[PDB]
Amino acid sequence: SALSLSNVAGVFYILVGGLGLAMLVALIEFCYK
């Protein structure tokens, strides 16, 4: 009976999703230049 990785996991996916989102908005930045 320790700490559940379940709850914490859901916040890992909004992160890597946000990383990919700004791996996307990053790629469009360099384009207009």
């Binding site: 009976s1 914490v8 916040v11 909004i14 946000g18 700004a22 908005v25 990053a26 930045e29």
Partner: protein, 181 residues
């Protein structure tokens, strides 16, 4: 500056760490609140699946002869250990066995009659405890000479006491109620 690209990466990673360090801050407060305990020793099958915690029985007695004669899967592994265990996992008396657990910091388990086990658990200083179900199926009884006139009387009277709940009441009296734990 306000580079809208990695601006949200800085923003989203911040939310990611806020939650995590809060989830740690929370669950740690619970660890310092309850501070529950666990005992490694569950069953007798838990004694034969490890070696770090030694164990033994009496050198001479029914408890010793049991494992020596037992031909059950789990119990077999226990006796093969005890017979050639170094140093001698066999103690001299019951008191020496309890003292060998009380002075091992939990590295020495002792196997005895479940009757005095529960009694030891209720004598000072409340350090030991029985764990798991008993290993066999025995029983104490009233002994009367063969062909006695007290034979059928006492036997029937025993059953009358148990169903009434006298025995259950009596054991609660000299073990737990007048126990010291």
């Amino acid at each position: 500056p306000r580079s809208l690209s990695g601006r949200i990466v800085g923003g989203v990673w911040w939310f990611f760490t806020l939650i995590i360090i809060s989830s740690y801050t929370a669950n740690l407060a619970a660890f310092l609140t309850v501070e529950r305990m666990v005992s490694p020793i569950e069953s007798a099958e838990d004694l034969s699946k490890q070696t770090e915690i030694a164990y033994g029985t009496l050198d001479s007695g029914s408890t010793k002869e049991f494992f020596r004669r037992s031909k059950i899967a789990v119990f077999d592994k226990m006796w093969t250990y005890m017979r050639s265990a170094e140093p001698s996992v066999f103690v001299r008396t019951t008191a020496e066995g309890v003292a060998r657990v009380r002075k091992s910091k939990g590295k020495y388990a002792y196997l005895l009659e479940s009757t005095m086990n529960e009694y030891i658990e209720q004598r000072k200083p409340c350090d030991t405890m029985k764990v798991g179900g008993n290993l066999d199926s025995k029983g104490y009884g009233i002994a009367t000479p063969k062909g006695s006139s007290l034979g059928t009387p006492v036997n029937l009277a025993v059953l009358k006491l148990s169903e009434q709940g006298v025995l259950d009441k009596l054991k609660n009296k000299w073990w737990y109620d007048k126990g010291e734990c």
